[PDB]
Design a binder for this molecule. Structure first.
Ligand SMILES: O=c1[nH]cc(O)c(=O)[nH]1
Ligand SMILES: [Cl-]
Ligand SMILES: [Cl-]
Ligand SMILES: [Cl-]
Ligand code: NA
Length: 229
């Protein structure tokens, strides 16, 4: 399960292993980066086994991509699926409480029971971050350390599939993927990030879930069942 030691055919789902072939060396380089962080006395999140978790759901099944910045910086929050937390986590991270506030306003569903977004992943929503690791307590600490090439390759591969795609890009780092979504089978929703620092600039009221479903149906795709327990 180590990115430095084992090839993509072992680490990620078959479709993803082929999609990410251009960045195979880059993923191994990120394994070396995290080895060097530990050797230097710094930690990272999420756990090594969860870093590539978004790519363990089938490539061919992705209909919607949600992109954030980087993983939760608090130990015990990040699980390798962007914005998701383990079902026993409480209180919810503030960004996730803001996502669920907009989920209820948009869809009219009750507040979810917990912060586990695996139902979305299991229904063709890719829960990605622009950067896939962070140092504990230090948001954006791994920006510019080599993940951007990996997530760029992930978007370009999705966008090249003979399939509709809708992208929801939360915040400025996620927005740097907008150029790779130019093709006519792809459409991108962009808003400020749901973080308390940015949410009041346009995340609240952005209705991303109903918009993504109108877009999927407009391209002849099935809408996402967003409903969480
Ligand atoms: O997974 C994530 N957790 C927290 C965020 O701010 C983010 O952009 N993504
Ligand atoms: Cl640390
Ligand atoms: Cl998925
Ligand atoms: Cl439409
Ligand atoms: Na999927």
């Amino acid at each position: 399960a180590s990115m430095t030691a084992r090839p993509l055919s072992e680490l990620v789902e078959r479709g993803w292993a082929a999609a990410l072939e251009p960045v195979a060396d880059q993923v191994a380089h990120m394994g070396q980066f995290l080895r060097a962080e530990i050797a230097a006395g710094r930690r990272y999140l999420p756990a090594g086994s969860n870093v590539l978790r978004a790519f363990t759901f089938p490539f061919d099944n992705v209909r919607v991509l949600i992109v954030g910045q980087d993983p939760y910086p608090t130990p015990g929050h990040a699980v390798g699926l962007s914005f998701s937390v383990a079902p026993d986590v409480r209180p919810w991270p503030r960004s996730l409480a803001n996502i669920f506030d907009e989920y209820t306003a948009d869809l009219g569903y009750p507040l979810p029971s917990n912060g586990d977004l695996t139902p979305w992943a299991q229904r063709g929503v890719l829960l990605l971050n622009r950067v896939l690791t962070v140092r504990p307590s230090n948001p954006a600490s791994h920006r510019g350390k080599g993940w951007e090439a990996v997530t760029e390759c992930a978007i370009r591969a999705l966008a090249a599939r003979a399939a509709p795609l809708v992208a929801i890009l939360w915040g400025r780092d996620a927005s740097t993927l907008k150029p790779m979504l130019a093709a006519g089978n792809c459409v991108a929703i962009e808003s400020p990030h749901p973080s308390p620092l940015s949410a009041s600039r346009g995340f609240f009221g952005s209705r991303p879930f109903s918009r993504a479903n109108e877009l999927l149906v407009g391209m002849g795709a099935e809408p996402i069942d967003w409903r969480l327990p």
